[PDB]
Design a protein around this ligand. Structure first.
Ligand SMILES: Cc1cccc(-c2nnc(Cn3c(N(C)C)nc4c3c(=O)n(C)c(=O)n4C)o2)c1
Ligand SMILES: Cc1cccc(-c2nnc(Cn3c(N(C)C)nc4c3c(=O)n(C)c(=O)n4C)o2)c1
Lengths: 195, 195
């Protein structure tokens, strides 16, 4: 009932561009929006993947494997699902598994993969697949995960119990410029509400 | 050990600006990032709020109150938690209850409120509080909720049972294409994952 009329390039970087979006509202009136888009999408179903890595161990509660990373847009460190762009010709599942191993060293198994879901629709067209990945933490390869030799990134790995995720997130994040990712927190919230 | 070095304005719009961010990695090397920022943040705890509205009625499943609206950056419709900017001097909780009532007509009670969390930390500094808000659907107030939408806003309200959220989201999307918000999906996903 609403439709895009035109989208005009305002400013383009290497990774991200800014667009003026002209669209029609249901009354037939023309309106505008400032839209942020990534420049790196080609034939992918979404810009990237977020990985929900479930560390499964027979002697432990399931943990969610999270990464702590400096994020320049945030001017501080962030606790996130392992995440990254889907490479050209790569599947969400493949990107998820690769990205998990690159960032954490864990070798996971696909559990499930979401449709493309939007990161911040009121602002950007950015989408990810949320790929749930199980990690056999008792398997010897996963005994001591190494974020797979060189990477170029500086990533601390954090494993938090699934049954206490939200509280463990709040605890971590009170100390300064360390922010929880919104999706991580949404996930944590539902774990808490569901019990 | 990592910190923002300089922030260079590339392009500033009314709602959103685009910056090239120079930061110091642990190696002592300077790197750049393209960062998106909202222009509308003031002296706030976060830019805005997302509301997780749990519609509660005796002898009924809890429902999650979601909103559907055309999102120009997505050039299509998205299913989201009610969300909007925190006004000046406003609390996250107050913004949440206000935003919930504006979009859905529901008058809710604060259940809990998150710290500021990142909408998309790899791209923007955008933060929200995720505010869980319970709605007594048996109260006369909420018998007949009336949205009070803003000039430009056209918001459809969709209430999905909490106990079957992920499926009902899928069901919605099968009926016709829309994008589910990532925070909504993360929430829905965790409801199934819980335990
Ligand atoms: C922090 C946060 C979290 C979730 C949602 C929001 C948000 N949703 N809408 C707005 C504000 N907004 C309005 N209005 C409220 C009219 N118009 C807008 C915008 C807008 O942001 N842009 C980028 C625009 O281009 N136009 C035209 O903010 C903000
Ligand atoms: C879709 C999605 C969802 C969640 C996280 C990401 C993401 N996180 N990092 C990247 C890729 N990236 C890299 N690298 C992987 C080096 N560098 C970057 C970027 C980058 O996006 N920008 C905006 C940049 O400015 N520089 C410098 O993508 C992508």
């Amino acid at each position: 009932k609403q439709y895009i009329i035109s989208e005009e390039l305002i400013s383009e970087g290497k990774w991200v561009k800014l667009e003026k979006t002209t669209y029609m509202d249901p009354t037939g009136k023309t309106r505008t929006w400032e839209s942020v888009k990534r420049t790196t999408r080609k034939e992918q179903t979404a810009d990237g993947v977020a990985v929900i890595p479930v560390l499964q161990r027979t002697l432990h509660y399931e943990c969610i494997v999270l990464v702590k990373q400096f994020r320049p847009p945030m001017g501080g460190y962030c606790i996130e699902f392992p995440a990254g762009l889907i490479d050209d010709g790569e599947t969400p599942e493949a990107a998820a598994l690769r990205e998990l191993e690159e960032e954490t060293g864990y070798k996971g198994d696909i559990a499930e993969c979401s449709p493309a879901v939007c990161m911040d629709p009121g602002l950007s067209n950015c989408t990810i697949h949320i790929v749930t990945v199980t990690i056999n933490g008792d398997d010897a390869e996963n005994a001591r995960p190494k974020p797979k030799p060189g990477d170029g990134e500086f990533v601390e790995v954090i494993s938090l119990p699934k049954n206490d995720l939200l509280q463990r997130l709040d605890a971590l994040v009170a100390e300064e410029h360390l922010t929880v990712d919104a999706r991580v927190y949404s996930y944590a919230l539902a774990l808490k509400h569901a019990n």
